[PDB]
Design an enzyme around this catalytic site. Structure first.
Site, PDB file in Angstrom:
ATOM      1  N   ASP A   1      -0.327   1.797   9.276  1.00 45.28           N
ATOM      2  CA  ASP A   1      -0.495   1.747  10.875  1.00 45.28           C
ATOM      3  C   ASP A   1       0.372   0.717  11.503  1.00 45.28           C
ATOM      4  O   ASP A   1       0.979   0.716  12.713  1.00 45.28           O
ATOM      5  CB  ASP A   1      -1.974   1.827  11.425  1.00 45.28           C
ATOM      6  CG  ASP A   1      -2.653   3.265  10.907  1.00 45.28           C
ATOM      7  OD1 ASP A   1      -1.863   4.258  10.334  1.00 45.28           O
ATOM      8  OD2 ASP A   1      -3.842   3.266  11.032  1.00 45.28           O
TER       9      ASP A   1
ATOM     10  N   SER B   1     -17.953  15.283  -3.636  1.00 44.93           N
ATOM     11  CA  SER B   1     -16.748  15.588  -4.354  1.00 44.93           C
ATOM     12  C   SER B   1     -15.346  15.086  -4.032  1.00 44.93           C
ATOM     13  O   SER B   1     -14.341  15.706  -3.548  1.00 44.93           O
ATOM     14  CB  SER B   1     -16.668  17.350  -4.367  1.00 44.93           C
ATOM     15  OG  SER B   1     -17.738  17.677  -5.031  1.00 44.93           O
TER      16      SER B   1
ATOM     17  N   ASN C   1      -9.334   1.052  -4.218  1.00 43.72           N
ATOM     18  CA  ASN C   1      -9.557   2.469  -3.891  1.00 43.72           C
ATOM     19  C   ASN C   1     -10.010   2.641  -2.370  1.00 43.72           C
ATOM     20  O   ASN C   1     -11.267   1.987  -2.320  1.00 43.72           O
ATOM     21  CB  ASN C   1     -10.082   3.416  -4.815  1.00 43.72           C
ATOM     22  CG  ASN C   1      -9.363   3.132  -6.148  1.00 43.72           C
ATOM     23  OD1 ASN C   1      -7.969   3.259  -6.302  1.00 43.72           O
ATOM     24  ND2 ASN C   1     -10.234   2.930  -7.168  1.00 43.72           N
TER      25      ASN C   1
ATOM     26  N   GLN D   1      -0.326  -9.513  -5.015  1.00 43.66           N
ATOM     27  CA  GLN D   1      -1.385  -8.329  -4.827  1.00 43.66           C
ATOM     28  C   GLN D   1      -2.735  -8.781  -4.639  1.00 43.66           C
ATOM     29  O   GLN D   1      -3.666  -7.995  -4.220  1.00 43.66           O
ATOM     30  CB  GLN D   1      -1.598  -7.585  -6.131  1.00 43.66           C
ATOM     31  CG  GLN D   1      -0.205  -6.836  -6.378  1.00 43.66           C
ATOM     32  CD  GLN D   1       0.233  -5.865  -5.486  1.00 43.66           C
ATOM     33  OE1 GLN D   1      -0.232  -4.739  -5.023  1.00 43.66           O
ATOM     34  NE2 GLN D   1       1.561  -6.317  -4.604  1.00 43.66           N
TER      35      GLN D   1
HETATM   36  N1  ADN Z   1      -8.036  12.629  11.084  1.00 46.22           N
HETATM   37  C1  ADN Z   1      -7.517  11.500  11.503  1.00 46.22           C
HETATM   38  N2  ADN Z   1      -7.106  11.207  12.925  1.00 46.22           N
HETATM   39  C2  ADN Z   1      -7.001  10.011  13.268  1.00 46.22           C
HETATM   40  N3  ADN Z   1      -7.049   8.966  12.635  1.00 46.22           N
HETATM   41  C3  ADN Z   1      -7.492   8.993  11.569  1.00 46.22           C
HETATM   42  C4  ADN Z   1      -7.718  10.218  10.797  1.00 46.22           C
HETATM   43  N4  ADN Z   1      -8.140  10.175   9.417  1.00 46.22           N
HETATM   44  C5  ADN Z   1      -8.147   8.729   9.260  1.00 46.22           C
HETATM   45  N5  ADN Z   1      -7.731   8.066  10.472  1.00 46.22           N
HETATM   46  C6  ADN Z   1      -7.586   6.609  10.442  1.00 46.22           C
HETATM   47  O1  ADN Z   1      -6.736   6.164   9.477  1.00 46.22           O
HETATM   48  C7  ADN Z   1      -6.854   4.492   9.928  1.00 46.22           C
HETATM   49  C8  ADN Z   1      -6.424   3.568   8.749  1.00 46.22           C
HETATM   50  O2  ADN Z   1      -4.985   3.879   8.593  1.00 46.22           O
HETATM   51  C9  ADN Z   1      -8.317   4.285   9.975  1.00 46.22           C
HETATM   52  O3  ADN Z   1      -8.347   3.487  11.285  1.00 46.22           O
HETATM   53  C10 ADN Z   1      -9.137   5.781  10.356  1.00 46.22           C
HETATM   54  O4  ADN Z   1      -9.711   5.753  11.699  1.00 46.22           O
HETATM   55  N1  ADN Z   2       0.892  -2.954  -2.958  1.00 41.92           N
HETATM   56  C1  ADN Z   2       1.345  -3.533  -1.805  1.00 41.92           C
HETATM   57  N2  ADN Z   2       1.829  -4.783  -2.066  1.00 41.92           N
HETATM   58  C2  ADN Z   2       2.582  -5.270  -1.045  1.00 41.92           C
HETATM   59  N3  ADN Z   2       2.955  -4.793   0.265  1.00 41.92           N
HETATM   60  C3  ADN Z   2       2.399  -3.628   0.279  1.00 41.92           C
HETATM   61  C4  ADN Z   2       1.412  -2.830  -0.495  1.00 41.92           C
HETATM   62  N4  ADN Z   2       0.867  -1.710  -0.373  1.00 41.92           N
HETATM   63  C5  ADN Z   2       1.742  -1.461   1.034  1.00 41.92           C
HETATM   64  N5  ADN Z   2       2.070  -2.643   1.435  1.00 41.92           N
HETATM   65  C6  ADN Z   2       2.870  -2.935   2.708  1.00 41.92           C
HETATM   66  O1  ADN Z   2       2.354  -2.150   3.798  1.00 41.92           O
HETATM   67  C7  ADN Z   2       3.437  -1.010   4.125  1.00 41.92           C
HETATM   68  C8  ADN Z   2       3.132   0.395   4.467  1.00 41.92           C
HETATM   69  O2  ADN Z   2       2.316   0.715   3.147  1.00 41.92           O
HETATM   70  C9  ADN Z   2       4.547  -1.285   2.991  1.00 41.92           C
HETATM   71  O3  ADN Z   2       5.792  -0.661   3.326  1.00 41.92           O
HETATM   72  C10 ADN Z   2       4.601  -2.664   2.566  1.00 41.92           C
HETATM   73  O4  ADN Z   2       5.243  -3.302   3.501  1.00 41.92           O
HETATM   74 MG    MG Z   3     -17.316  18.043  -7.036  1.00 42.02          MG
HETATM   75 MG    MG Z   4      -0.440   6.316   6.771  1.00 39.41          MG
HETATM   76 MG    MG Z   5      -7.003   2.072  -7.607  1.00 42.33          MG
END
Ligand code: ADN
Ligand code: ADN
Ligand code: MG
Ligand code: MG
Ligand code: MG
Ligand code: CL
Ligand code: CL
Length: 342
Positions: free
Chosen positions: A297, A29, A128, A286
């Site tokens: 991050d 889910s 995704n 893209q």
């Molecule tokens: N609950 C959480 N606490 C800390 N880091 C997280 C959590 N869920 C996702 N992340 C982290 O987000 C990062 C990517 O943004 C991944 O490296 C992943 O480990």
């Molecule tokens: N679809 C995208 N195309 C280009 N840069 C991206 C995209 N998504 C995220 N970023 C870069 O990663 C940062 C954190 O999402 C954005 O402010 C941008 O600088």
């Molecule tokens: Mg379901």
């Molecule tokens: Mg974030």
């Molecule tokens: Mg998508």
């Protein structure tokens, strides 16, 4: 500038990713793009992922990723950035320690053996990513057992800028508050991330307890929308939400709050005491995009690398866009040997 000038703490996690199918997302889910905590019902998920698909393992954790990126951009000296978190005494834990050291970060872990090192599943479908965090050892962090020891607290006192992802509020809100109050008392900078919609929904009480101490707040456009809904703002416009969030009650009158909301390929929004301004994302290609979560991050890591060097906000935003552009096209928040930012 010098060693331990930047301090971060959070959940150290080993990321386990694989490209899965629609049947797998339906079985558990899972929403195609989402970030949630692992419940007891998800124990089957982690075993099936590693058994039915080709997986890769990379050291992760949101705050840990941002601290590694900040250190990379700072370059010299080694150990300019500090990191605290909890891990298990196992093979996964050794991987996390080895990678923090290779990143030149000053990492000090709370090691215990009741729980295994935490992991995070990244279930990929095309462009995704559905994330499920099994915190395990990460959720065992205790301030009385680590943060409060003399030797560790001294490291926090050396910092001029502190950063903690909102994710850590589900583990040790008492630790987040101790660090935030110290910054407020000593007129130092305290920064925080909204992290994911679930932080503004289910943990909003801890979030709002810390908010008066937040000098700079980071988040993306879906986290901003959730926060606005839950706080009763009655608007869905990103610029208006940034304005209202900036105006929330603040403890330290010596520093006005700064709010920064990213919007993917759309403009990054910045709210200050006087206005709300927009910064274009100039890297619009893209085709090679791989990991947008890690890009968020990396944006924070780049921004923080310039805040400790005492640079204007315009430069902090350019550094954030630069680091995000490098990490977004790679796996595991990795980057080239040296940054090309002057
Ligand atoms: N609950 C959480 N606490 C800390 N880091 C997280 C959590 N869920 C996702 N992340 C982290 O987000 C990062 C990517 O943004 C991944 O490296 C992943 O480990
Ligand atoms: N679809 C995208 N195309 C280009 N840069 C991206 C995209 N998504 C995220 N970023 C870069 O990663 C940062 C954190 O999402 C954005 O402010 C941008 O600088
Ligand atoms: Mg379901
Ligand atoms: Mg974030
Ligand atoms: Mg998508
Ligand atoms: Cl974290
Ligand atoms: Cl972001």
């Amino acid at each position: 500038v010098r060693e331990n000038i930047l301090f971060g703490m959070g959940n150290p996690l080993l990321d386990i990713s694989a490209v899965v199918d629609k049947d797998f997302l339906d079985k558990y889910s899972l929403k195609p793009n989402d970030q949630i905590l692992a419940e007891d019902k998800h124990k089957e998920l982690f075993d099936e992922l590693v058994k039915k698909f080709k997986v890769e393992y990379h050291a992760g954790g949101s705050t840990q990723n941002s601290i590694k990126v900040a250190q990379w951009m700072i370059q010299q000296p080694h150990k300019a950035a500090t990191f605290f978190g909890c891990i298990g005494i196992d093979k996964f834990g050794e991987i996390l320690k080895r990678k923090a050291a290779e990143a030149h970060v000053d990492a000090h872990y709370y090691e215990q053996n009741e729980q295994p090192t935490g992991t995070c599943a990244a279930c990929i479908t095309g462009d995704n990513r559905s994330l499920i965090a099994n915190l395990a050892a990460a959720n065992c962090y205790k301030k009385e057992k680590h943060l409060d020891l003399e030797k560790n607290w001294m490291l926090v006192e050396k910092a001029r800028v502190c950063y903690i992802a909102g994710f850590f509020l589900t583990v040790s809100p008492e630790s987040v508050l101790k660090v935030a109050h110290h910054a407020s008392e000593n007129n130092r900078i305290f920064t925080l991330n909204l992290s994911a919609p679930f932080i503004s929904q289910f943990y909003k009480e801890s979030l709002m307890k810390v908010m008066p101490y937040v000098d700079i707040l980071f988040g993306n456009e879906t986290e901003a929308a959730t926060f606005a809904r839950e706080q009763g703002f009655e608007t869905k416009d990103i610029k208006e939400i940034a304005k209202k969030t900036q105006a929330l009650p603040k403890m330290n009158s010596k520093r006005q709050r700064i709010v920064i909301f990213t919007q993917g390929r759309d403009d990054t929004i910045m709210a200050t005491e006087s206005e709300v301004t927009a910064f274009a994302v100039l890297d619009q290609d893209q085709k090679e995009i791989i990991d947008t979560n890690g890009a968020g991050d990396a944006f924070v890591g780049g921004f923080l690398s310039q805040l400790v060097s005492d640079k204007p906000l315009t430069e902090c935003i350019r550094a954030g866009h630069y680091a995000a552009s490098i990490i977004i096209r790679r796996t595991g928040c990795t980057f080239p040997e040296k940054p090309d930012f002057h």
